[PDB]
Amino acid sequence: ADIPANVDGARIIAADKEPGNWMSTGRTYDEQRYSPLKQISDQNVGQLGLAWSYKLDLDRGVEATPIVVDGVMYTTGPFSVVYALDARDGRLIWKYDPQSDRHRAGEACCDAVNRGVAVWKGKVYVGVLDGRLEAIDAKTGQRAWSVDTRADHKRSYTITGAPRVVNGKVVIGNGGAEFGVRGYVTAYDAETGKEAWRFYTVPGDPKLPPEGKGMEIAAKTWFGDAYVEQGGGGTAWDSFAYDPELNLLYIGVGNGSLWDPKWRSQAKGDNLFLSSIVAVNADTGEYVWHYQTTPGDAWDYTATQHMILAELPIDGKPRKVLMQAPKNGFFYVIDRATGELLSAKGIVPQSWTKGMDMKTGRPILDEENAAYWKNGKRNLVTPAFWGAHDWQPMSYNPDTGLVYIPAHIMSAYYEHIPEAPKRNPFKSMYQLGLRTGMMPEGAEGLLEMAKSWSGKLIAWDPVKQQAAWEVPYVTIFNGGTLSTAGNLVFEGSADGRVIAYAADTGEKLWEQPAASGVMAAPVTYSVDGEQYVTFMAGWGGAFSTFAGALSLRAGVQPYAQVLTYKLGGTAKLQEPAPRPDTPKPPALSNDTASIEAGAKLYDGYCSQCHGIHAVSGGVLPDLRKLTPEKHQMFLGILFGGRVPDGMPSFADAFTPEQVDQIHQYLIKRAHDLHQEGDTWKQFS
Ligand code: HEC
Ligand SMILES: O=C(O)c1cc(C(=O)O)c2c(n1)C(=O)C(=O)c1cc(C(=O)O)[nH]c1-2
Ligand SMILES: [Ca+2]
């Protein structure tokens, strides 16, 4: 047998000769996520059945796109643990736990997720939460090399996305724009992990001369130097695409840090390359072209979203394009060689813009509704921080010419803080520089707000700039898609199931429960001529952690496991045990001032993980259902006693009295829970 995971440039480029394999996160460099396999089709997909499953170690967000090469599957679970499984029956071959430094677990904004690995010449590459990029021997399961990609240990840098390997170089970015960091993309040698090059996405100290054409161009679009301490943002924490013929690596750049443009860049400048699509030479990393989807990004509008390279008929002529549906709500068709904007259309309502100006390729700002930094109001904006589309991958099907997008219809308030926020030294707290996500505390209000949020699979036609068909979901954060030559599109839903639709009409043809929400993109491969289809299930991520209450509309519990199906499968689906009863809360406090003080601390230090207003999404602990014993050791826990479980220490940020204030607030919220509880039952 050949070396396991023996993938190289030519093998990926020639992926169609091996449709039974999935050797790059998006199967191919164009990341179309379209499988030529058709044993399973719109004619028999109804016979599909679970073949095997594997239980992952932690029940938190599962966002991994499995990689399959010659009988072996390489996937991941929470905290970047890498698994190698026999693709035929799910037998565990080896398990590599990089042991992501839990002391830095709170540096992750959106749950301890990982979107998968990459392979190359017998090695598996994984981006570890704590910021390390590591190579793993495909055969032994032992570490080959490891490098700390963090350019500054004082900044909250993390890695959640899947790396891509180009010309023997492992490409990876990082996350952290919610805490305040300067974004960048690094390329390391696949063999030694020796840094090949590094492309920063936003300028640094404006005093120093710009380094590289990219920065000479970007530096002009920023004013003042307050963004240097803030970080600037522009992290490339997710998607990447690559065109061999043009030798261009396509980088998806994220949002600005801080979010507020007035505090970040004197409310002036486009702030390149924030919320932009950037192309650079795969071998040198030098700038070639770019397209900014959201100039002066002020609403957390990243452009790290999935980019698909394809060829389409535009104006009667074949055009090699790049397609993307970033957070701002536009679907872009761009010439992947020159950066020319070929077309742009909203796939969802957008309150921030009055539409695109095709003469310049720049969107017109709707100040009255979105310029919260200039107007005086708290604007309800849509899309909001989770966009019209987030990380969940989309896919392209050449037999229909449609792009299947897991879209969102959500909104939130964006309010400007009058005084210039001052950077905080604590590394585990959001630092957005503005007020957002405000919502009712009462259950009635939350439910009402949740009804304004919804999701939907959009089968978009990039040429017509129109939706061919659409399928609605009760909430957001539904799974990524997968297209196949069998007139099928697969997708997992937030509400708990795995589905198969007819690619051309959207008719639901197959469906099974998944035991938990399915956010990861589905994958398909073959072994001994038999086609398999696998989903990575596990509710979690940013949605169900931060907006705990709203996400309850999904009615699913966390339960991370690999689920793979095949024609005839009869294996049984394992399900999570019932949620335990909630112990009764301790006596409520008469110190409202203390309660109030605690509420403000909680909002700034605990919401991203335990839920806004203490209402958890059920993935991470709900602080209103603490047992009497946990209440007894509340100080010890807050001060590091639970670090091994990802519960950061707050010993460096709070005084004991402050900890007690939060405690009193949580106990008060626990009593509110009691008053309600039925109102909560009607979320699902
Ligand atoms: C994400 C980085 C977190 C932030 C921010 C806060 N907490 Fe947390 N907390 C987190 C995890 C992953 C866990 C436990 C996971 C497991 O399975 O063990 C916890 C746990 C707690 C607990 C104990 C709950 C229980 O055992 O029932 C408490 C009391 C707690 N956390 C409090 C707390 C407070 C007050 C926070 C804001 C200052 C806070 N947490 C933030 C993850 C994260
Ligand atoms: O600003 C950043 O650096 C950054 C990083 C990440 C991450 O690494 O997961 C997310 C986001 N932003 C983000 O804006 C977002 O909506 C998001 C959702 C998720 C998820 O896993 O569901 N991650 C992230
Ligand atoms: Ca962000």
JSON list of N, CA, C and O and ligand atoms in Angstrom, two decimals, residues 60 105-106 428 605-606 608-610 620-621 623 626 630 634 637-638 642 645-648 650 654 662 666, ligand 1:
[
{"chain": "A", "resi": 60, "resn": "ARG", "atom": "N", "xyz": [-19.11, 19.85, 22.06]},
{"chain": "A", "resi": 60, "resn": "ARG", "atom": "CA", "xyz": [-19.10, 21.28, 21.78]},
{"chain": "A", "resi": 60, "resn": "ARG", "atom": "C", "xyz": [-19.15, 21.40, 20.25]},
{"chain": "A", "resi": 60, "resn": "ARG", "atom": "O", "xyz": [-19.23, 20.38, 19.56]},
{"chain": "A", "resi": 105, "resn": "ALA", "atom": "N", "xyz": [-7.89, 29.19, 26.55]},
{"chain": "A", "resi": 105, "resn": "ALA", "atom": "CA", "xyz": [-9.16, 28.79, 25.95]},
{"chain": "A", "resi": 105, "resn": "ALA", "atom": "C", "xyz": [-10.12, 29.96, 25.77]},
{"chain": "A", "resi": 105, "resn": "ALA", "atom": "O", "xyz": [-10.92, 29.98, 24.84]},
{"chain": "A", "resi": 106, "resn": "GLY", "atom": "N", "xyz": [-10.03, 30.94, 26.67]},
{"chain": "A", "resi": 106, "resn": "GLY", "atom": "CA", "xyz": [-10.91, 32.10, 26.60]},
{"chain": "A", "resi": 106, "resn": "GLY", "atom": "C", "xyz": [-10.50, 33.09, 25.52]},
{"chain": "A", "resi": 106, "resn": "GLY", "atom": "O", "xyz": [-11.14, 34.12, 25.36]},
{"chain": "A", "resi": 428, "resn": "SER", "atom": "N", "xyz": [-9.13, 37.43, 27.66]},
{"chain": "A", "resi": 428, "resn": "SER", "atom": "CA", "xyz": [-10.31, 36.60, 27.40]},
{"chain": "A", "resi": 428, "resn": "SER", "atom": "C", "xyz": [-11.65, 37.32, 27.36]},
{"chain": "A", "resi": 428, "resn": "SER", "atom": "O", "xyz": [-12.69, 36.71, 27.56]},
{"chain": "A", "resi": 605, "resn": "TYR", "atom": "N", "xyz": [-17.73, 40.03, 30.42]},
{"chain": "A", "resi": 605, "resn": "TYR", "atom": "CA", "xyz": [-16.78, 38.94, 30.59]},
{"chain": "A", "resi": 605, "resn": "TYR", "atom": "C", "xyz": [-17.26, 37.50, 30.43]},
{"chain": "A", "resi": 605, "resn": "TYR", "atom": "O", "xyz": [-16.43, 36.61, 30.24]},
{"chain": "A", "resi": 606, "resn": "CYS", "atom": "N", "xyz": [-18.57, 37.25, 30.49]},
{"chain": "A", "resi": 606, "resn": "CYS", "atom": "CA", "xyz": [-19.07, 35.87, 30.40]},
{"chain": "A", "resi": 606, "resn": "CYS", "atom": "C", "xyz": [-20.04, 35.55, 29.28]},
{"chain": "A", "resi": 606, "resn": "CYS", "atom": "O", "xyz": [-20.24, 34.38, 28.96]},
{"chain": "A", "resi": 608, "resn": "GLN", "atom": "N", "xyz": [-20.10, 35.69, 25.92]},
{"chain": "A", "resi": 608, "resn": "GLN", "atom": "CA", "xyz": [-19.73, 34.93, 24.73]},
{"chain": "A", "resi": 608, "resn": "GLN", "atom": "C", "xyz": [-19.73, 33.42, 24.93]},
{"chain": "A", "resi": 608, "resn": "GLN", "atom": "O", "xyz": [-19.83, 32.68, 23.95]},
{"chain": "A", "resi": 609, "resn": "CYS", "atom": "N", "xyz": [-19.64, 32.95, 26.17]},
{"chain": "A", "resi": 609, "resn": "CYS", "atom": "CA", "xyz": [-19.63, 31.51, 26.42]},
{"chain": "A", "resi": 609, "resn": "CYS", "atom": "C", "xyz": [-20.84, 31.00, 27.20]},
{"chain": "A", "resi": 609, "resn": "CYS", "atom": "O", "xyz": [-21.36, 29.92, 26.90]},
{"chain": "A", "resi": 610, "resn": "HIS", "atom": "N", "xyz": [-21.31, 31.76, 28.19]},
{"chain": "A", "resi": 610, "resn": "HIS", "atom": "CA", "xyz": [-22.45, 31.29, 28.97]},
{"chain": "A", "resi": 610, "resn": "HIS", "atom": "C", "xyz": [-23.79, 31.88, 28.52]},
{"chain": "A", "resi": 610, "resn": "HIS", "atom": "O", "xyz": [-24.84, 31.56, 29.08]},
{"chain": "A", "resi": 620, "resn": "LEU", "atom": "N", "xyz": [-22.76, 25.09, 26.49]},
{"chain": "A", "resi": 620, "resn": "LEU", "atom": "CA", "xyz": [-21.88, 25.37, 27.61]},
{"chain": "A", "resi": 620, "resn": "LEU", "atom": "C", "xyz": [-22.77, 25.51, 28.84]},
{"chain": "A", "resi": 620, "resn": "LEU", "atom": "O", "xyz": [-23.97, 25.77, 28.72]},
{"chain": "A", "resi": 621, "resn": "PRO", "atom": "N", "xyz": [-22.20, 25.33, 30.04]},
{"chain": "A", "resi": 621, "resn": "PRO", "atom": "CA", "xyz": [-22.98, 25.43, 31.27]},
{"chain": "A", "resi": 621, "resn": "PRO", "atom": "C", "xyz": [-23.90, 26.64, 31.39]},
{"chain": "A", "resi": 621, "resn": "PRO", "atom": "O", "xyz": [-23.56, 27.75, 30.97]},
{"chain": "A", "resi": 623, "resn": "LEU", "atom": "N", "xyz": [-25.34, 29.13, 33.86]},
{"chain": "A", "resi": 623, "resn": "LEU", "atom": "CA", "xyz": [-25.03, 29.59, 35.20]},
{"chain": "A", "resi": 623, "resn": "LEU", "atom": "C", "xyz": [-26.22, 29.79, 36.13]},
{"chain": "A", "resi": 623, "resn": "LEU", "atom": "O", "xyz": [-26.04, 30.12, 37.30]},
{"chain": "A", "resi": 626, "resn": "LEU", "atom": "N", "xyz": [-26.84, 26.15, 38.53]},
{"chain": "A", "resi": 626, "resn": "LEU", "atom": "CA", "xyz": [-25.72, 25.66, 39.32]},
{"chain": "A", "resi": 626, "resn": "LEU", "atom": "C", "xyz": [-26.18, 24.87, 40.54]},
{"chain": "A", "resi": 626, "resn": "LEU", "atom": "O", "xyz": [-27.12, 25.27, 41.23]},
{"chain": "A", "resi": 630, "resn": "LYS", "atom": "N", "xyz": [-21.58, 23.82, 43.45]},
{"chain": "A", "resi": 630, "resn": "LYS", "atom": "CA", "xyz": [-20.87, 24.73, 42.55]},
{"chain": "A", "resi": 630, "resn": "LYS", "atom": "C", "xyz": [-20.93, 26.14, 43.11]},
{"chain": "A", "resi": 630, "resn": "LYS", "atom": "O", "xyz": [-19.97, 26.89, 43.00]},
{"chain": "A", "resi": 634, "resn": "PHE", "atom": "N", "xyz": [-17.73, 28.90, 43.88]},
{"chain": "A", "resi": 634, "resn": "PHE", "atom": "CA", "xyz": [-17.85, 29.88, 42.80]},
{"chain": "A", "resi": 634, "resn": "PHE", "atom": "C", "xyz": [-16.60, 30.76, 42.65]},
{"chain": "A", "resi": 634, "resn": "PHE", "atom": "O", "xyz": [-16.21, 31.11, 41.54]},
{"chain": "A", "resi": 637, "resn": "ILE", "atom": "N", "xyz": [-13.68, 28.62, 41.29]},
{"chain": "A", "resi": 637, "resn": "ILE", "atom": "CA", "xyz": [-13.89, 28.30, 39.88]},
{"chain": "A", "resi": 637, "resn": "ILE", "atom": "C", "xyz": [-13.55, 29.52, 39.04]},
{"chain": "A", "resi": 637, "resn": "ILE", "atom": "O", "xyz": [-12.81, 29.42, 38.06]},
{"chain": "A", "resi": 638, "resn": "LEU", "atom": "N", "xyz": [-14.08, 30.67, 39.43]},
{"chain": "A", "resi": 638, "resn": "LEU", "atom": "CA", "xyz": [-13.82, 31.89, 38.70]},
{"chain": "A", "resi": 638, "resn": "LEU", "atom": "C", "xyz": [-12.33, 32.23, 38.70]},
{"chain": "A", "resi": 638, "resn": "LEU", "atom": "O", "xyz": [-11.84, 32.87, 37.77]},
{"chain": "A", "resi": 642, "resn": "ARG", "atom": "N", "xyz": [-11.25, 25.76, 37.19]},
{"chain": "A", "resi": 642, "resn": "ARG", "atom": "CA", "xyz": [-11.81, 24.95, 36.12]},
{"chain": "A", "resi": 642, "resn": "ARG", "atom": "C", "xyz": [-11.13, 25.15, 34.77]},
{"chain": "A", "resi": 642, "resn": "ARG", "atom": "O", "xyz": [-11.68, 24.79, 33.73]},
{"chain": "A", "resi": 645, "resn": "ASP", "atom": "N", "xyz": [-11.00, 22.58, 31.96]},
{"chain": "A", "resi": 645, "resn": "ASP", "atom": "CA", "xyz": [-12.21, 22.38, 31.17]},
{"chain": "A", "resi": 645, "resn": "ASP", "atom": "C", "xyz": [-12.50, 23.54, 30.22]},
{"chain": "A", "resi": 645, "resn": "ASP", "atom": "O", "xyz": [-13.58, 23.61, 29.63]},
{"chain": "A", "resi": 646, "resn": "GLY", "atom": "N", "xyz": [-11.54, 24.46, 30.06]},
{"chain": "A", "resi": 646, "resn": "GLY", "atom": "CA", "xyz": [-11.75, 25.59, 29.16]},
{"chain": "A", "resi": 646, "resn": "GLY", "atom": "C", "xyz": [-12.39, 26.80, 29.83]},
{"chain": "A", "resi": 646, "resn": "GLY", "atom": "O", "xyz": [-12.71, 27.79, 29.16]},
{"chain": "A", "resi": 647, "resn": "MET", "atom": "N", "xyz": [-12.60, 26.72, 31.14]},
{"chain": "A", "resi": 647, "resn": "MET", "atom": "CA", "xyz": [-13.20, 27.81, 31.90]},
{"chain": "A", "resi": 647, "resn": "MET", "atom": "C", "xyz": [-12.04, 28.69, 32.35]},
{"chain": "A", "resi": 647, "resn": "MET", "atom": "O", "xyz": [-11.39, 28.41, 33.35]},
{"chain": "A", "resi": 648, "resn": "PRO", "atom": "N", "xyz": [-11.78, 29.77, 31.61]},
{"chain": "A", "resi": 648, "resn": "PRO", "atom": "CA", "xyz": [-10.68, 30.68, 31.95]},
{"chain": "A", "resi": 648, "resn": "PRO", "atom": "C", "xyz": [-10.67, 31.19, 33.38]},
{"chain": "A", "resi": 648, "resn": "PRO", "atom": "O", "xyz": [-11.69, 31.19, 34.06]},
{"chain": "A", "resi": 650, "resn": "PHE", "atom": "N", "xyz": [-10.24, 34.19, 36.08]},
{"chain": "A", "resi": 650, "resn": "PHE", "atom": "CA", "xyz": [-10.51, 35.61, 36.12]},
{"chain": "A", "resi": 650, "resn": "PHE", "atom": "C", "xyz": [-9.81, 36.26, 37.31]},
{"chain": "A", "resi": 650, "resn": "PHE", "atom": "O", "xyz": [-10.15, 37.38, 37.72]},
{"chain": "A", "resi": 654, "resn": "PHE", "atom": "N", "xyz": [-10.73, 40.33, 38.21]},
{"chain": "A", "resi": 654, "resn": "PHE", "atom": "CA", "xyz": [-11.75, 40.64, 39.22]},
{"chain": "A", "resi": 654, "resn": "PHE", "atom": "C", "xyz": [-11.23, 40.59, 40.65]},
{"chain": "A", "resi": 654, "resn": "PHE", "atom": "O", "xyz": [-10.25, 39.89, 40.94]},
{"chain": "A", "resi": 662, "resn": "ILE", "atom": "N", "xyz": [-21.20, 39.20, 40.56]},
{"chain": "A", "resi": 662, "resn": "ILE", "atom": "CA", "xyz": [-21.64, 38.41, 39.43]},
{"chain": "A", "resi": 662, "resn": "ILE", "atom": "C", "xyz": [-22.50, 37.28, 39.98]},
{"chain": "A", "resi": 662, "resn": "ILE", "atom": "O", "xyz": [-23.58, 37.00, 39.46]},
{"chain": "A", "resi": 666, "resn": "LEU", "atom": "N", "xyz": [-26.30, 36.14, 39.02]},
{"chain": "A", "resi": 666, "resn": "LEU", "atom": "CA", "xyz": [-26.66, 34.82, 38.52]},
{"chain": "A", "resi": 666, "resn": "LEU", "atom": "C", "xyz": [-27.75, 34.18, 39.36]},
{"chain": "A", "resi": 666, "resn": "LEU", "atom": "O", "xyz": [-28.64, 33.51, 38.84]},
{"chain": "B", "resi": 1, "resn": "HEC", "atom": "C1", "xyz": [-15.50, 30.70, 27.44]},
{"chain": "B", "resi": 1, "resn": "HEC", "atom": "C2", "xyz": [-14.04, 31.02, 27.08]},
{"chain": "B", "resi": 1, "resn": "HEC", "atom": "C3", "xyz": [-15.94, 31.03, 28.86]},
{"chain": "B", "resi": 1, "resn": "HEC", "atom": "C4", "xyz": [-16.11, 32.24, 29.42]},
{"chain": "B", "resi": 1, "resn": "HEC", "atom": "C5", "xyz": [-15.88, 33.65, 28.82]},
{"chain": "B", "resi": 1, "resn": "HEC", "atom": "C6", "xyz": [-16.61, 32.00, 30.77]},
{"chain": "B", "resi": 1, "resn": "HEC", "atom": "N1", "xyz": [-16.73, 30.64, 31.01]},
{"chain": "B", "resi": 1, "resn": "HEC", "atom": "FE1", "xyz": [-17.41, 29.77, 32.67]},
{"chain": "B", "resi": 1, "resn": "HEC", "atom": "N2", "xyz": [-17.12, 28.00, 31.88]},
{"chain": "B", "resi": 1, "resn": "HEC", "atom": "C7", "xyz": [-16.62, 27.71, 30.61]},
{"chain": "B", "resi": 1, "resn": "HEC", "atom": "C8", "xyz": [-16.55, 26.26, 30.41]},
{"chain": "B", "resi": 1, "resn": "HEC", "atom": "C9", "xyz": [-16.03, 25.62, 29.10]},
{"chain": "B", "resi": 1, "resn": "HEC", "atom": "C10", "xyz": [-17.01, 25.67, 31.57]},
{"chain": "B", "resi": 1, "resn": "HEC", "atom": "C11", "xyz": [-17.17, 24.16, 31.97]},
{"chain": "B", "resi": 1, "resn": "HEC", "atom": "C12", "xyz": [-17.04, 23.09, 30.85]},
{"chain": "B", "resi": 1, "resn": "HEC", "atom": "C13", "xyz": [-17.20, 21.67, 31.37]},
{"chain": "B", "resi": 1, "resn": "HEC", "atom": "O1", "xyz": [-17.77, 20.82, 30.67]},
{"chain": "B", "resi": 1, "resn": "HEC", "atom": "O2", "xyz": [-16.71, 21.46, 32.50]},
{"chain": "B", "resi": 1, "resn": "HEC", "atom": "C14", "xyz": [-17.36, 26.76, 32.46]},
{"chain": "B", "resi": 1, "resn": "HEC", "atom": "C15", "xyz": [-17.88, 26.60, 33.72]},
{"chain": "B", "resi": 1, "resn": "HEC", "atom": "C16", "xyz": [-18.24, 27.58, 34.60]},
{"chain": "B", "resi": 1, "resn": "HEC", "atom": "C17", "xyz": [-18.81, 27.38, 35.94]},
{"chain": "B", "resi": 1, "resn": "HEC", "atom": "C18", "xyz": [-19.11, 26.01, 36.57]},
{"chain": "B", "resi": 1, "resn": "HEC", "atom": "C19", "xyz": [-20.47, 25.49, 36.05]},
{"chain": "B", "resi": 1, "resn": "HEC", "atom": "C20", "xyz": [-20.86, 24.07, 36.45]},
{"chain": "B", "resi": 1, "resn": "HEC", "atom": "O3", "xyz": [-19.89, 23.28, 36.71]},
{"chain": "B", "resi": 1, "resn": "HEC", "atom": "O4", "xyz": [-22.06, 23.79, 36.49]},
{"chain": "B", "resi": 1, "resn": "HEC", "atom": "C21", "xyz": [-19.02, 28.60, 36.46]},
{"chain": "B", "resi": 1, "resn": "HEC", "atom": "C22", "xyz": [-19.61, 28.94, 37.84]},
{"chain": "B", "resi": 1, "resn": "HEC", "atom": "C23", "xyz": [-18.60, 29.58, 35.48]},
{"chain": "B", "resi": 1, "resn": "HEC", "atom": "N3", "xyz": [-18.13, 28.92, 34.36]},
{"chain": "B", "resi": 1, "resn": "HEC", "atom": "C24", "xyz": [-18.64, 30.93, 35.62]},
{"chain": "B", "resi": 1, "resn": "HEC", "atom": "C25", "xyz": [-18.25, 31.86, 34.71]},
{"chain": "B", "resi": 1, "resn": "HEC", "atom": "C26", "xyz": [-18.32, 33.29, 34.93]},
{"chain": "B", "resi": 1, "resn": "HEC", "atom": "C27", "xyz": [-18.87, 33.96, 36.21]},
{"chain": "B", "resi": 1, "resn": "HEC", "atom": "C28", "xyz": [-17.82, 33.88, 33.82]},
{"chain": "B", "resi": 1, "resn": "HEC", "atom": "C29", "xyz": [-17.65, 35.37, 33.50]},
{"chain": "B", "resi": 1, "resn": "HEC", "atom": "C30", "xyz": [-16.61, 36.07, 34.41]},
{"chain": "B", "resi": 1, "resn": "HEC", "atom": "C31", "xyz": [-17.46, 32.83, 32.91]},
{"chain": "B", "resi": 1, "resn": "HEC", "atom": "N4", "xyz": [-17.72, 31.60, 33.46]},
{"chain": "B", "resi": 1, "resn": "HEC", "atom": "C32", "xyz": [-16.93, 33.00, 31.65]},
{"chain": "B", "resi": 1, "resn": "HEC", "atom": "C33", "xyz": [-16.27, 28.67, 29.69]},
{"chain": "B", "resi": 1, "resn": "HEC", "atom": "C34", "xyz": [-16.31, 30.03, 29.84]}
]
